[PDB]
């Protein structure tokens, strides 16, 4: 029942802060704003902890001017200013059999990822090949958790950019198409094939000057 409360009454337009009722216009406005917020967010230093709180902070920075629920995961009830409450504990990509994390799996998976990152020292001290493989595993874990109602891709990509930066690697998603990212995501989650994601991260990553100069 509560998932309908993400939309205006009898509409396919997500409730938003921009004053927009046209779903196409909302998409374009949001795309432009999240791109700009990403440019500005890149100026912020990477944190010492790459945790679920940080992921929520990224989503909030990218989306708070668009959605009231920016930074809030979809397992959690969210009450809009209009007094209605929304959430969406279960989500499955269209056309596909394998769903994203359901309900409390979202928190459990983000906790497991946090622990893995801590154990691996945020992927510091790796070879280029190792870093790419490990970054791909982190990304597929994020993909499955899919913690937000919308905006997961933009965030996950920002989380990776900052994780990379703190580990001495530049990860540049602009080097590839959306289609390639989608393909790699589908292969990993729908077809249990982790290779395309590994190749993707190899292709868009290089060690930074400092990591070379050291
Ligand atoms: N069928 C799928 N199975 C698993 N992951 C997918 C699938 N399709 C897309 N993805 C990935 O899910 C993530 C979120 O996609 P995105 O386009 O940001 O949607 P949203 O805005 O709904 O969160 C991206 O990393 C994307 O590549
Ligand atoms: Mg997105």
Residue numbers in the entry: 1 to 214
Could you share sentences copied from the article?
Proteins containing a FIC domain catalyze AMPylation and other post-translational modifications (PTMs). Among these, Bartonella effector proteins (Beps) comprise a particularly diverse ensemble of FIC domains that subvert various host cellular functions. The FIC fold comprises eight conserved α-helices and encompasses a characteristic active site loop between helices α4 and α5 that forms most of the catalytic center and the substrate binding pocket. Additionally, FIC domains generally contain a β-hairpin between helix α2 and helix α3 that is referred to as the “flap” and mediates docking of a target segment in extended conformation via β-strand augmentation.
